[PDB]
Design an enzyme around this catalytic site. Sequence first.
Site, PDB file in Angstrom:
ATOM      1  N   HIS A 127       0.803  -1.218   0.000  1.00  0.00           N
ATOM      2  CA  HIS A 127       0.000   0.000   0.000  1.00  0.00           C
ATOM      3  C   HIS A 127       0.844   1.280   0.000  1.00  0.00           C
ATOM      4  CE1 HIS A 127       0.287   0.536   4.508  1.00  0.00           C
ATOM      5  NE2 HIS A 127       0.223   1.795   4.111  1.00  0.00           N
ATOM      6  N   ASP A 174      -0.445  -7.326   2.315  1.00  0.00           N
ATOM      7  CA  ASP A 174       0.118  -5.982   2.082  1.00  0.00           C
ATOM      8  C   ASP A 174       1.653  -6.163   2.068  1.00  0.00           C
ATOM      9  OD1 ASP A 174       0.378  -3.212   1.885  1.00  0.00           O
ATOM     10  OD2 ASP A 174      -0.116  -2.844   3.991  1.00  0.00           O
ATOM     11  N   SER A 229       4.451   2.738   8.058  1.00  0.00           N
ATOM     12  CA  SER A 229       4.104   1.543   7.296  1.00  0.00           C
ATOM     13  C   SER A 229       5.221   1.136   6.330  1.00  0.00           C
ATOM     14  CB  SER A 229       2.729   1.724   6.609  1.00  0.00           C
ATOM     15  OG  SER A 229       2.785   2.550   5.481  1.00  0.00           O
TER      16      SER A 229
HETATM   17  N1  LIG Z   1      -1.718   2.721  14.171  1.00  0.00           N
HETATM   18  C1  LIG Z   1      -1.063   2.003  13.288  1.00  0.00           C
HETATM   19  N2  LIG Z   1      -0.445   0.889  13.631  1.00  0.00           N
HETATM   20  C2  LIG Z   1      -0.982   2.342  11.910  1.00  0.00           C
HETATM   21  C3  LIG Z   1       0.164   1.927  11.186  1.00  0.00           C
HETATM   22  C4  LIG Z   1       0.287   2.202   9.806  1.00  0.00           C
HETATM   23  C5  LIG Z   1      -0.755   2.919   9.145  1.00  0.00           C
HETATM   24  N3  LIG Z   1      -0.884   3.282   7.880  1.00  0.00           N
HETATM   25  C6  LIG Z   1      -2.066   3.948   7.679  1.00  0.00           C
HETATM   26  C7  LIG Z   1      -2.497   4.444   6.403  1.00  0.00           C
HETATM   27  O1  LIG Z   1      -2.355   5.625   6.054  1.00  0.00           O
HETATM   28  N4  LIG Z   1      -3.142   3.476   5.478  1.00  0.00           N
HETATM   29  C8  LIG Z   1      -3.664   3.858   4.092  1.00  0.00           C
HETATM   30  C9  LIG Z   1      -5.207   3.815   4.290  1.00  0.00           C
HETATM   31  C10 LIG Z   1      -5.625   2.424   4.767  1.00  0.00           C
HETATM   32  C11 LIG Z   1      -7.159   2.312   5.052  1.00  0.00           C
HETATM   33  C12 LIG Z   1      -7.573   0.833   5.315  1.00  0.00           C
HETATM   34  C13 LIG Z   1      -7.747   0.319   6.661  1.00  0.00           C
HETATM   35  C14 LIG Z   1      -8.116  -1.019   6.894  1.00  0.00           C
HETATM   36  C15 LIG Z   1      -8.318  -1.865   5.780  1.00  0.00           C
HETATM   37  C16 LIG Z   1      -8.157  -1.389   4.451  1.00  0.00           C
HETATM   38  C17 LIG Z   1      -7.790  -0.059   4.219  1.00  0.00           C
HETATM   39  C18 LIG Z   1      -4.825   1.993   6.073  1.00  0.00           C
HETATM   40  C19 LIG Z   1      -3.358   2.073   5.817  1.00  0.00           C
HETATM   41  C20 LIG Z   1      -2.703   3.986   8.924  1.00  0.00           C
HETATM   42  C21 LIG Z   1      -1.905   3.344   9.863  1.00  0.00           C
HETATM   43  C22 LIG Z   1      -2.041   3.069  11.253  1.00  0.00           C
END
Ligand SMILES: N=C(N)c1ccc2[nH]c(C(=O)N3CCC(Cc4ccccc4)CC3)cc2c1
Lengths: 28, 12, 250
Positions: C43, C99, C198
């Site tokens: 992602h 991912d 991430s």
């Molecule tokens: N608190 C944490 N551990 C944490 C770590 C990494 C992250 N990356 C993102 C982020 O910006 N993302 C892009 C949008 C996505 C939305 C999503 C959420 C669940 C399932 C499918 C898509 C999530 C990842 C949120 C996020 C939160």
Amino acid sequence: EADCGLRPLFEKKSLEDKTERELLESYI
Amino acid sequence: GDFEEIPEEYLQ
Amino acid sequence: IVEGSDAEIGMSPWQVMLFRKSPQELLCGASLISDRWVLTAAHCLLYPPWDKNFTENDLLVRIGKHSRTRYERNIEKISMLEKIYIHPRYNWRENLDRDIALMKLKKPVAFSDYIHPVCLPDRETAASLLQAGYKGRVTGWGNLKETGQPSVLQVVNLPIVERPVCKDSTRIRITDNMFCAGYKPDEGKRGDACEGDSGGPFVMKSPFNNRWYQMGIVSWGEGCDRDGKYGFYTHVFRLKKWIQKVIDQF
Ligand SMILES: N=C(N)c1ccc2[nH]c(C(=O)N3CCC(Cc4ccccc4)CC3)cc2c1
Ligand SMILES: *[C@@H]1O[C@H](CO)[C@@H](O)[C@H](O)[C@H]1NC(C)=O
Ligand code: NA
Ligand code: NA
């Protein structure tokens, strides 16, 4: 890799970082 | 803040 | 990383920074698994709902860094990418299942006191270390709080959480290809990864051979360090066959 996961400044010198003991202590 | 300029060789 | 601390110099020699060419900015974390391969979250490169779709020519990989914004002359190495491989079944439409992505460097990077690959787990190591209660370590230059940026690499140690607890904390459908980590609201300790982190590694130190193994990849979470919520990580061992396939064939 042959020496993967062994850090030059730590494991290779037999020095531990500040919190790795926390990890090891959790492995029952 | 923002990032520091990196050598141009890595931008081509 | 939220509620972590500054990392010591050379503490995570496999930590990699995914850097965008223009505008120059931090995109995500990553990890060095050999002299020519970097591991990260899919992602970080592909997420259509946000019109995100980076190609090899769009970014750079920066290795051996400690400071987030400075060009660490004579310490860090900046590499160009030759090819990006995203898991064929990466599920961006629903739950970010699988991912994971691999990036092939144009040229091998030389190792040093600050640049060194992490190990990939074998079935036995995974079975032995991936247990509830056992702690892993996450690192990154990501956000310090949900809602700024650290000056140097941050680090936090977090316990792996029981699958039922992980499932019962979200509405998202969780798969075998992910695990969650973090403290429970009652444990009186906090910490989580956050946006910008991430793609980074969740590692563990084997008590059997003293080596560091990457068990997970920072994938997602709802907010950061929210009580009752947990960080979710891609299960690296579960996807090792695909990793070996890509490396061997390409
Ligand atoms: N608190 C944490 N551990 C944490 C770590 C990494 C992250 N990356 C993102 C982020 O910006 N993302 C892009 C949008 C996505 C939305 C999503 C959420 C669940 C399932 C499918 C898509 C999530 C990842 C949120 C996020 C939160
Ligand atoms: C992403 O970019 C690539 C360019 O390589 C393109 O072929 C593809 O159609 C784009 N969209 C997706 C969802 O891959
Ligand atoms: Na649920
Ligand atoms: Na939490």
